[PDB]
Amino acid sequence: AFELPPLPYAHDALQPHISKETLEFHHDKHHNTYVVNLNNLVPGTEFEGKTLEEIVKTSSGGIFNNAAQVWNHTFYWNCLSPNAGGQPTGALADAINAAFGSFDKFKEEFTKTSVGTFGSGWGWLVKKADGSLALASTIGAGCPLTIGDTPLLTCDVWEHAYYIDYRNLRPKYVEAFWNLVNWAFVAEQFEGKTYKV
Amino acid sequence: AFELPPLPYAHDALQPHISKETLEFHHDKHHNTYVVNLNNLVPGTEFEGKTLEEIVKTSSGGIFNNAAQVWNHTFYWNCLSPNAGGQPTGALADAINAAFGSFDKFKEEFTKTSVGTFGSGWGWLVKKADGSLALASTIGAGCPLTIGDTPLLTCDVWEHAYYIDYRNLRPKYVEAFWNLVNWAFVAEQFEGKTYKV
Numbered sequence: 447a448f449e450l451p452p453l454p455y456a457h458d459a460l461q462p463h464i465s466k467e468t469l470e471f472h473h474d475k476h477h478n479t480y481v482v483n484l485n486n487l488v489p490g491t492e493f494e495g496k497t498l499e500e501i502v503k504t505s506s507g508g509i510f511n512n513a514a515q516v517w518n519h520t521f522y523w524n525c526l527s528p529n530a531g532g533q534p535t536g537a538l539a540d541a542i543n544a545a546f547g548s549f550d551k552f553k554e555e556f557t558k559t560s561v562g563t564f565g566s567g568w569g570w571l572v573k574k575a576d577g578s579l580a581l582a583s584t585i586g587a588g589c590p591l592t593i594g595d596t597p598l599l600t601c602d603v604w605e606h607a608y609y610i611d612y613r614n615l616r617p618k619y620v621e622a623f624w625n626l627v628n629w630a631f632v633a634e635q636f637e638g639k640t641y642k643v
Numbered sequence: 644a645f646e647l648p649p650l651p652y653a654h655d656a657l658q659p660h661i662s663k664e665t666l667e668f669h670h671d672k673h674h675n676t677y678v679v680n681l682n683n684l685v686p687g688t689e690f691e692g693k694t695l696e697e698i699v700k701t702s703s704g705g706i707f708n709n710a711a712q713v714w715n716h717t718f719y720w721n722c723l724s725p726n727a728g729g730q731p732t733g734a735l736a737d738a739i740n741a742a743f744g745s746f747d748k749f750k751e752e753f754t755k756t757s758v759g760t761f762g763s764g765w766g767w768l769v770k771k772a773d774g775s776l777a778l779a780s781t782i783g784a785g786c787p788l789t790i791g792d793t794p795l796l797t798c799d800v801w802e803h804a805y806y807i808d809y810r811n812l813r814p815k816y817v818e819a820f821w822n823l824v825n826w827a828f829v830a831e832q833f834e835g836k837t838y839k840v
């Protein structure tokens with residue numbers, strides 16, 4: 447059955463941008479719940495052998511909400527890391543600077559897309575089927591995988607992602623998340639070995 | 644312009660079911676923000692003279708999300724109170740026991756409807772146009788007023804309504820909310836002077 451992927455870093459590794467408490471709750475409880483619920487939902491269905499990506503790509507209803515949320519969260523943890531942040535270099539940086547004009551202007555628009563997500567949702571930086579870059583905002587457990595797009599970066603805006611550390615100040619959370627982005631991971635997604643399982 | 648209604652009780656009046664901190668944030672900040680945004684949104688539009696209820700009933704988009712969230716919150720604060728909880732008596736109790744079988748089974752189903760709201764939303768107990776009782780779950784700022792139904796009771800399940808006190812334990816929040824319900828207010832809505840502003 448599906449399993450909860452260990453955190454790619456220590457629980458206190460992302461301080462002081464995201465507390466250890468936030469990670470314990472967000473990863474140990476919330477993420478875990480989605481995993482548990484997915485494992486209770488797949489038995490006896492046509493999703494019994496499929497892979498996470500496979501399920502979120504063909505499922506709907508409650509199976510989807512949980513499957514997509516598990517993936518979204520695993521992907522999300524990888525988009526972050528200690529001693530990171532900064533900017534992307536190489537082809538990624540060119541794709542961004544060419545699609546958004548500059549990295550600072552990409553952050554501006556990525557921030558607007560995230561913060562402007564009404565309610566529970568996610569902010570995304572994706573690569574379309576034509577290799578072009580694009581921003582997307584999903585609500586709930588919405589995942590770019592279902593539109594054939596390729597996720598390069600994501601930002602969880604569900605209130606539990608930041609309430610402990612920023613309360614209602616969602617913008618201050620997004621701003622501090624920039625200091626944790628794992629551009630190496632984003633780059634890998636951009637063009638190379640895309641994240642799976 | 645629209646104003647933020649004072650809390651019907653002290654900020655620490657609902658302890659220990661809902662902390663004073665939760666009320667200061669939920670009411671003083673979140674509730675207030677929806678008010679402030681509504682006031683920036685209505686000027687120059689066709690909602691310039693209307694009432695809160697009028698706006699949430701004929702608006703859409705961002706004007707709606709803010710108008711309905713202001714209403715939902717004001718209504719919500721009234722559905723709670725110190726030295727309350729218990730059960731409804733009279734005609735309300737009859738309508739409940741007749742629609743749900745018993746008050747305990749109504750709580751079961753109301754709880755299921757609330758907790759089962761995926762993401763940000765609200766749990767409701769309404770009275771349809773044919774006087775029958777019904778449960779509803781809205782996402783985001785969804786309000787039963789727009790369906791011509793009559794809200795009797797509501798439970799905010801946006802994570803900010805309980806994260807400070809229960810974190811991811813939404814169920815323990817709903818369970819503690821029952822100890823705060825102001826049934827007199829719910830009764831008023833059931834049949835009589837319905838809430839205004």
Ligand SMILES: [Fe+3]
Pocket residue numbers: 669673716799801803804
């Ligand atoms: Fe709220």
